[PDB]
Ligand binder design. Structure first.
Ligand SMILES: CCCCCCCCCCCCCCCCCC(=O)OC[C@H](COP(=O)([O-])OCC(O)COP(=O)([O-])OC[C@@H](COC(=O)CCCCCCCCCCCCCCCCC)OC(=O)CCCCCCCCCCCCCCCCC)OC(=O)CCCCCCCCCCCCCCCCC
Ligand SMILES: COC1=C(OC)C(=O)C(C/C=C(/C)CC/C=C(/C)CC/C=C(/C)CC/C=C(\C)CC/C=C(\C)CC/C=C(\C)CC/C=C(/C)CC/C=C(/C)CC/C=C(/C)CCC=C(C)C)=C(C)C1=O
Ligand SMILES: CCCCCCCCCCCCCCCCC[C@@H](O)O[C@H](CO[C@H](O)CCCCCCCCCCCCCCC)COP(=O)(O)OCC[N+](C)(C)C
Ligand SMILES: CCCCCCCCCCCCCCCCC[C@@H](O)O[C@H](CO[C@H](O)CCCCCCCCCCCCCCC)COP(=O)(O)OCC[N+](C)(C)C
Ligand SMILES: CCCCCCCCCCCCCCCCC[C@@H](O)O[C@H](CO[C@H](O)CCCCCCCCCCCCCCC)COP(=O)(O)OCC[N+](C)(C)C
Ligand SMILES: CCCCCCCC/C=C\CCCCCCCC(=O)OC[C@H](COP(=O)(O)OCCN)OC(=O)CCCCCCC/C=C\CCCCCCCC
Ligand SMILES: CCCCCCCC/C=C\CCCCCCCC(=O)OC[C@H](COP(=O)(O)OCCN)OC(=O)CCCCCCC/C=C\CCCCCCCC
Ligand SMILES: CCCCCCCC/C=C\CCCCCCCC(=O)OC[C@H](COP(=O)(O)OCCN)OC(=O)CCCCCCC/C=C\CCCCCCCC
Ligand SMILES: CCCCCCCC/C=C\CCCCCCCC(=O)O[C@H](COC(=O)CCCCCCC/C=C/CCCCCCCC)COP(=O)(O)OCCN
Ligand SMILES: CCCCCCCC/C=C\CCCCCCCC(=O)O[C@H](COC(=O)CCCCCCC/C=C/CCCCCCCC)COP(=O)(O)OCCN
Ligand SMILES: CCCCCCCCCCC1=C(C)C(=O)C(OC)=C(OC)C1=O
Ligand code: SF4
Lengths: 71, 83, 105, 98, 156, 175, 318, 115, 70
């Protein structure tokens, strides 16, 4: 159940980032929305910055240092 | 026989700490090879499920793989409960 | 120079530690396990000279996984454009990107 | 690369420069050697932690072990040097020329 | 006046603290020190008053001059007195420290430690009994209790 | 961007390295190395290396106690030097400080390749992994694997330690 | 609300430390056929307050030959470390819950010695230098044996988490399984806190005052506070390590009372030992630790590694 | 985050105590009060002169013995491996070599202080 | 006493009672009264984060039972 929820949450975050990027970067002439940086077409586990790039600093802090700093 | 007896007596009279240390170290080296519970310790270590058991794709030729955890097939920790 | 005693005797003195995709304890995977696996299987048995050219795509993907330079560049470009559009007031971030989202498990 | 990687590499460069430029005391150069080892430990630990290379987690510890040996080695030599001269100044080690 | 009352109460507090915790230096010269050792003995138990010997002059409050002070020793006594941080007190114990005593007319004896350091209490005797020394320390406690440093500062 | 705690820690690391590399009296060099060890422990703790950081701090504390004793024995002078008691020491300290300042400025203000490569900074938090599983610590497992995977490493390390004891005894014999 | 918890941890420890001095003076007195402080307040209950007020209203002095920065830094380091080392202790809950609390405590202990070392060196006096070198020798004497004893004892716990020590000793005290090591551990604590018969860094009868001879008033009081706090803290650690109190999740005050009583018993045992014995020579301490404690410690480490495998009694939580 | 706050609080309290101790009382500093202490007299030499270490060899050996602690600390986690025989063999071998080092230095008079 | 040593000891004991007890009470006050959660491993932290996300008030200790499955 945790696995299914994690997949849904990650995919939702990535889709939200995709839509925001599509809205934001409409003016740049040679930019493809959602273009990958890998030649391979297989699934790549998202990096922290990709998931939390366009969010608040508090969410980023909780995502990065939340577990380590919890005591 | 007698030479070792005299040497051990002199050591026990002069250096009891060293005698005890060597005895404890020798016992620690020797005893594990003669114990029947070392195998039990290994099996207890193997029986701890740290990661998820990934199921196998059924192909109709595995009589010894359960289709449900409560099925009789597979390993059993009945020995562990009484241990 | 390199007397391969390990290969002659079949000992594995230090080959268990040479690569990231090789039998970690508890089956804990490396961050770039798939990319390294792809590159190693591409380059196996063809020699270094041919592997440098014919397996350059796999190695580039592996290095991108390792260091994430291109991903950081893309994220920086997106954030720079977002800041530029926000300073002139043409763009507004959505509520879920401002801390007022509806969380899900 | 993160800015932390650059800071650690700069720390190694500073320690190497401090070792290569000698003042009088040999103990200072030994301390520069120890600092170089510490920076190497930090750099390797950060790389191995970031890449999640599990079996490499024992690599830094081994480094420390041999660092100790090197440290001990240096101190041993220092003692003898002092015993000859009453001082650890490197300018007394000039009996041999090129 | 509120300020006068405040400074009086603060004077009371600091005087109580300083007289309830008196740490003399571990310092004795002659027979008198033996009687001093009998004041720390169980019968009198000077520690029960809060009086504890401390070897370091930096950590001590009181100089008890228990014994004859010679000319060869006077610079050392003055040095370890000067190295006592303030506030500091000196108790002269016995005839030799008070005025020279039995060796007053000698060529090598200082005729009283008050030629070298200021003295707060003079304890007579040759030697004073441990009880007489205890009386001297209690009198010094009373004298410290009579101090009005903060009131004097306020009235300046 | 998030509070740049790791950047501040690494900057203090570099400052301590400059402190002991300008080579004042070995007392202050040892102090600087102790500070650098503690701060590097903090960095590794922030990246998830609890055991490794704590161990490096402990090891360097013991080594620096030995170094302090040896400095008082055979590395002293009438007037031990501080970072401001010497033109050479102060010059080296200042040069290291401004060199770190220049490197940092050329790093976070623009993308330039100093020696090896270039980058933008952006704080370490970006390059993490968001791995979500486990009832253990991967660092502890990898370190504990030394007794099951690294038999060869244990053998060579123990041999080197015994040989090092023999070696120091041979060296300090004199005669 | 976490700052409230920090204050509720640190202030009572200082208050406890102040009263500890009064108890030692009285315990020493009654063991020496006298009374100890019984005049300043009822039963001398106001004596620590008077001592503190006297010490903090006295003039501190900077030695002319001293190195001012290190001279000031050393007492701050000592007191701050003494306060810090209490945060992972489970009573039965810790202020800071660490996976590796024992290793953190070891590292902070190792760092605490540098307060003594730097105070002795920066005092720029001969007796202070002798005291600092004695501290170096003491650390070299006890460190490795202490660490190996900790490892051997914790092999039965399964991890370095302090709170797990409560679960390990749920039915029996760990001492009943490791009473030999415990004795050695006790002695190591006496050497770790510079307590008699191993009070060599100060060494009043030999070095006047040792490392802190040049310190007066407030910094000296801070050194004293740090030392007594370390005494109480190490006895609390020993009580947690070897005498496991039974913990009720719904009644943690029972555990707190049990733990405090055991800690007070161990501290009073320290005071008793100070009252009973002469002082070691600081070379004899190193010979004792390296020629008697180390071989037994190594043999017992070997035995305690082999024992859980032999009996199939390996604890959980890899 | 909490540990940083605790460390800051402890250091701040100690520093504030030092500040109180140095700024509250009345100070009267003169050259005789601040002179070095040698129990009655001026020291003959400097305290910065070399001070011989008679236990230098034991001090060096402490460096090598301090890393055996690093090697032996992961033993509780190593005890959870499946191949307990190899782990036990390696741990016992490491401790045996440590004991052999101690014995070698002991028999070669390496634990005796210099005269 | 010799029992005159007891009062000071008692004071010390009272002081040593304060920290742990306080911690317990504080741990109950800021965690819904139910023994602050321990997260030594990332699985426990993930459980806590999921609890906070599904609490509806950004507080992990607000527990949702079977009344939340309508
Ligand atoms: C970037 C630049 C770096 C910034 C340095 C930070 C501040 C330190 C410098 C100020 C001290 C200088 C004062 C002075 O000279 O006379 C005092 C002054 C003047 O008296 P004086 O007799 O006329 O002068 C005598 C001579 O001039 C000279 O007297 P001296 O013999 O004392 O000279 C020595 C002194 C002179 O200073 C210098 O030489 C130049 C200053 C540069 C020092 C930097 C070297 C790098 C060391 C490692 C990195 C440390 C952190 C730096 C990074 C900053 C970010 C935090 O150097 C020091 O000793 C300072 C050492 C600082 C390290 C403290 C850390 C404690 C370590 C504990 C373990 C930690 C665990 C792991 C972590 O008298 C007073 O004011 C009363 C005492 C004041 C001292 C208070 C405490 C000292 C500062 C504490 C350090 C801050 C830590 C946080
Ligand atoms: C054989 O003789 C000797 C003894 O026997 C009689 C001793 O006891 C003895 C030990 C010294 C004693 C006299 C004890 C001295 C008492 C201390 C130096 C005072 C320390 C107490 C304070 C500084 C602690 C702070 C007090 C506060 C109220 C605590 C709370 C803090 C606030 C912020 C709140 C020595 C050295 C000795 O030599
Ligand atoms: C909170 C942290 C900051 C402050 C730190 C200090 C805390 C305050 C100190 C505690 C005060 C208690 C001391 C009072 C004890 C007096 C007991 C009695 O004996 O005193 C008598 C009278 O009292 C004294 O005259 C005055 C002492 C009372 C002090 C005045 C109260 C001021 C309190 C203000 C506190 C403010 C602190 C700083 C705030 C910023 C004189 O009797 P004495 O001659 O000795 O004994 C003779 C011996 N016999 C009995 C055997 C025959
Ligand atoms: C050719 C001449 C031979 C004699 C001289 C050789 C000189 C070199 C010294 C010894 C040679 C090293 C060979 C041992 C390599 C270790 C690997 C191999 O032996 O397997 C180990 C078998 O274990 C053995 O017990 C190794 C221990 C034997 C060595 C201990 C004592 C010998 C040391 C002698 C020289 C050292 C210095 C001097 C000491 C006095 C572990 O394998 P295992 O655990 O199954 O599975 C691991 C894979 N997993 C993780 C996926 C499960
Ligand atoms: C227990 C932990 C909690 C403690 C909390 C309190 C922390 C206290 C920290 C230290 C304070 C205790 C010291 C006692 C009072 C301070 C007096 C000193 O620090 O300042 C004096 C102030 O002197 C200054 O040099 C002159 C004052 C002018 C400078 C002030 C700058 C701004 C004032 C401008 C006037 C307009 C008002 C602006 C503010 C609103 C200097 O006196 P000085 O003689 O050297 O030193 C000896 C002090 N004696 C006499 C008490 C022994
Ligand atoms: C009250 C006004 C405060 C003024 C502060 C001035 C500080 C200063 O340097 O002055 C020197 C002053 C007294 O000198 P005098 O002027 O002669 O005496 C006063 C009578 N006129 O000395 C002091 O008080 C020094 C106080 C120390 C400052 C506190 C900062 C220390 C920082 C320590 C960091 C190291 C911590 C190590 C442990 C951490 C590791 C985890
Ligand atoms: C100085 C000593 C530095 C080391 C302090 C050790 C702190 C510690 O061990 O806490 C660990 C704790 C939790 O780790 P786990 O126990 O594994 O639990 C996580 C799973 N829930 O980790 C943390 O909280 C990381 C927080 C950052 C570490 C603190 C870094 C501080 C280093 C010292 C810098 C001092 C200030 C700089 C000035 C230098 C001196 C002048
Ligand atoms: C850790 C436990 C202790 C904590 C530390 C705080 C101690 C609190 C003590 C409170 C008692 C009041 C202190 C009074 C003593 C001050 C020192 C002193 O006696 O100076 C006297 C001095 C004499 O000067 P003069 O007569 O003009 O010159 C003669 C020499 N040529 O008079 C003064 O300077 C008056 C100064 C007023 C004292 C301040 C009172 C305020 C107390 C605040 C305490 C702060 C607590 C934190
Ligand atoms: C097979 C076990 C191996 C592993 C276990 C060992 C664990 C650790 C123990 C070894 C640690 C190092 C030991 C170092 C030995 C050095 C011996 C030595 O030279 O010391 C002699 C002292 O000892 C000797 O006399 C030489 C050896 C004496 C015998 C010691 C024990 C030998 C073996 C006896 C035990 C056998 C096993 C027990 C059997 C039980 C009986 C049925 C000199 O003493 P000083 O301090 O210099 O004297 C100064 C004051 N006069
Ligand atoms: C079947 C397998 C079982 C495993 C084996 C178990 C049996 C173990 C048998 C031996 C156990 C001995 C444990 C003690 C370890 C050290 C003992 C020792 O011999 O040390 C002494 C010295 O030890 C001391 O005297 C200690 C001095 C410090 C005294 C300080 C106070 C004493 C403490 C009093 C109460 C102790 C309470 C400890 C436990 C408290 C609870 C935690 C050696 O020194 P010397 O006599 O001078 O001779 C050296 C040259 N041959
Ligand atoms: C702490 C137990 C009581 C100790 C009292 C310390 C007294 C210090 C005086 C110095 C002294 C000592 C030590 C001393 O032992 C002695 O006898 C020869 C003297 O001559 C009478 C002395 O003056
Ligand atoms: S006064 Fe009498 S008892 Fe005291 S020191 Fe002089 S001669 Fe001795």
């Amino acid at each position: 159940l945790f696995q299914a929820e994690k997949d849904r949450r990650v995919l939702q975050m990535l889709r939200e980032n995709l839509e925001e990027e599509a809205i934001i970067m409409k003016d740049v002439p040679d930019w493809k929305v959602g273009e990958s940086v890998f030649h391979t077409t297989r699934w790549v586990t998202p990096m922290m910055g990709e998931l939390y790039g366009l969010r608040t600093n508090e969410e980023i802090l909780s995502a990065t240092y939340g577990f380590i700093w919890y005591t | 026989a007698g030479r070792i007896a005299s040497f051990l007596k002199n050591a026990w009279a002069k250096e009891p700490v060293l005698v005890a240390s060597f005895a404890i170290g020798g016992l620690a080296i020797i005893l594990p090879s003669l114990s029947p519970y070392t195998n039990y310790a290994i099996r207890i270590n193997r029986a701890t499920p740290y990661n998820y058991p990934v199921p196998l794709r059924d192909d109709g030729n595995m009589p010894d793989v359960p289709s449900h955890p409560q099925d009789p097939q597979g390993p059993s920790l009945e020995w562990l409960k009484n241990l | 120079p390199f007397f391969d005693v390990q290969k002659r005797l079949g000992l594995d003195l230090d080959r268990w530690m040479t690569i990231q995709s090789a039998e970690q304890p508890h089956k804990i995977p490396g961050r770039c396990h798939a990319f390294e696996k792809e590159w190693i299987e591409c380059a196996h048995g063809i020699g270094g000279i041919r592997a440098e050219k014919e397996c350059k795509i796999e190695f580039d993907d592996f290095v991108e996984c390792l260091l994430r330079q291109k991903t950081m560049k893309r994220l920086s470009a997106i954030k720079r454009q977002r800041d530029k559009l926000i300073k002139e007031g043409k763009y507004t971030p959505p509520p879920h990107h401002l801390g007022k989202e509806d969380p899900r498990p | 690369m993160p800015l932390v990687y650059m800071n650690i590499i700069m720390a190694f460069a500073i320690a190497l420069a401090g070792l290569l430029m000698y003042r009088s005391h040999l103990m200072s150069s030994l301390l520069c050697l120890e600092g170089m080892m510490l920076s190497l430990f930090i750099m390797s630990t950060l790389i191995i932690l970031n890449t999640h290379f599990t079996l490499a987690n024992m690599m830094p510890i081994i480094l420390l072990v041999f660092a100790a040996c090197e440290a001990a080695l240096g101190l041993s030599l220092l003692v003898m040097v002092s015993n000859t001269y009453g001082t650890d100044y490197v300018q007394n080690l000039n009996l041999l020329q090129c | 006046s509120r300020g006068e009352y405040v400074v009086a109460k603060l004077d009371d507090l600091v005087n109580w603290a300083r007289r309830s915790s008196l740490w003399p230096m571990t310092f004795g010269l002659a027979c008198c020190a033996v009687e001093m050792m009998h004041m720390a003995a169980p019968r009198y138990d000077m520690d029960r008053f809060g009086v504890v010997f401390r070897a370091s002059p930096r950590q001590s409050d009181v100089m008890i001059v228990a014994g004859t002070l010679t000319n060869k020793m006077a610079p050392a006594l003055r040095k370890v007195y000067d190295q006592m941080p303030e506030p500091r007190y000196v108790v002269s114990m016995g005839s030799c420290a008070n005025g020279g005593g039995y060796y007053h007319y000698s060529y090598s004896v200082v005729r009283g430690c008050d030629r070298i350091v200021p003295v707060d209490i003079y304890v007579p005797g040759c030697p004073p009994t441990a009880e007489a020394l205890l009386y001297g320390i209690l009198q010094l406690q009373r004298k410290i209790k009579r101090e009005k440093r903060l009131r004097i500062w306020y009235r300046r | 961007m998030t509070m740049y705690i790791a950047f501040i820690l690494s900057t203090i690391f570099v400052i301590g390295f400059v402190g002991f590399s300008s080579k004042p009296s070995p007392i202050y060099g040892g102090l600087g190395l102790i500070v650098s060890g503690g701060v590097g422990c903090g960095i590794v703790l922030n990246f998830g290396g609890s055991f490794l950081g704590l161990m490096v701090f402990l090891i360097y504390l013991g080594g620096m106690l030995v170094v302090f004793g040896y400095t008082t024995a055979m590395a002293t002078e009438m007037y031990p030097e501080v970072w401001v008691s010497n033109k050479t020491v102060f010059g080296a300290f200042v040069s290291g400080l401004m060199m770190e300042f220049c490197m940092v400025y050329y790093a976070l203000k623009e993308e330039e390749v100093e020696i090896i490569f270039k980058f933008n900074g952006l704080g370490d938090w970006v390059i993490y992994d968001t791995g979500d599983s486990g009832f253990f610590s991967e660092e502890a497992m990898g370190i504990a694997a030394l007794y099951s995977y690294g038999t060869w490493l244990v053998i060579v390390t123990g041999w080197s330690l015994l040989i090092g004891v023999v070696v120091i005894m041979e060296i300090t014999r004199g005669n | 609300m976490f700052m409230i918890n920090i204050l509720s941890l640190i202030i009572p420890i200082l208050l406890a430390v102040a009263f500890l001095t009064l108890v030692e003076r009285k315990v020493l007195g009654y063991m020496q056929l006298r009374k100890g402080p019984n005049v300043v307040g009822p039963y001398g209950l106001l004596q620590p307050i008077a001592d503190a007020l006297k010490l903090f209203t006295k003039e501190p002095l900077r030695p002319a030959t001293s190195s001012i920065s290190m001279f000031i830094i050393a007492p701050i380091l000592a007191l701050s470390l003494a306060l810090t080392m209490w945060v992972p202790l489970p009573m039965p809950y810790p202020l800071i819950n660490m996976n590796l609390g024992v290793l953190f405590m070891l590292a902070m202990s190792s760092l605490a010695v540098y307060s003594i070392l730097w105070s002795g060196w920066a005092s720029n006096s001969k007796y202070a230098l002798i005291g600092a070198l004695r501290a170096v020798a003491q650390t070299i004497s006890y460190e490795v044996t202490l660490a190996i004893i900790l490892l051997s004892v914790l092999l039965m716990n399964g991890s370095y988490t302090l709170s797990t020590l409560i679960t390990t000793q749920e039915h029996i005290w760990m001492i009943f399984t490791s009473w030999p090591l415990a004795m050695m551990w006790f002695i190591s604590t006496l050497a770790e806190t510079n307590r008699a018969p191993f009070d060599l860094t100060e060494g009043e009868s030999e070095l006047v005052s040792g490392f802190n001879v040049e310190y007066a008033a407030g910094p000296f009081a801070m050194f004293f506070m740090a030392e007594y706090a370390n005494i109480i803290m190490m006895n609390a650690f020993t009580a947690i390590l070897f005498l496991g109190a039974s913990h009720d999740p719904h009644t943690p005050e029972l555990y707190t009372i049990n733990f405090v009583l055991k800690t007070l018993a161990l501290t009073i045992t320290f005071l008793w030992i100070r009252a009973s014995y002469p002082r070691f020579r600081y070379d004899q301490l190193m010979h004792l630790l390296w020629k008697s404690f180390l071989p037994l410690t190594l043999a017992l480490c070997m035995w305690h590694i082999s024992l859980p495998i032999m009996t199939a009694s390996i604890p959980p939580q890899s | 985050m909490n540990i940083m706050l605790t460390l800051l609080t402890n250091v701040t309290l100690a520093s504030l105590l030092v500040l109180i101790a140095f700024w509250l009382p009345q100070l009267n500093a003169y050259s005789e009060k601040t002179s070095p202490y040698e129990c009655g007299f001026d020291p003959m030499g400097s305290a910065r002169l070399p001070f011989s270490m008679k236990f230098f060899l034991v001090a060096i050996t402490f460096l090598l013995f301090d890393l055996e602690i690093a090697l032996l600390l992961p033993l509780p986690w190593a005890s959870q491996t499946n191949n307990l025989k190899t782990m036990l063999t390696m741990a016992l071998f490491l401790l045996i070599l440590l004991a052999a080092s101690l014995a070698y230095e002991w028999t070669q008079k390496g634990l005796e202080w210099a005269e | 006493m010799w029992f005159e040593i007891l009062p000071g000891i008692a004071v010390m004991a009272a002081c040593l009672f304060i920290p742990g007890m306080a911690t317990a009470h504080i741990h109950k006050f800021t965690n819904g009264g139910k023994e602050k959660r321990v997260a030594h491993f990332s699985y426990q932290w993930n459980l806590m984060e999921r609890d906070r996300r599904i609490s509806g008030v950004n507080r992990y200790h607000v527990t949702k039972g079977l009344e939340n499955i309508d």
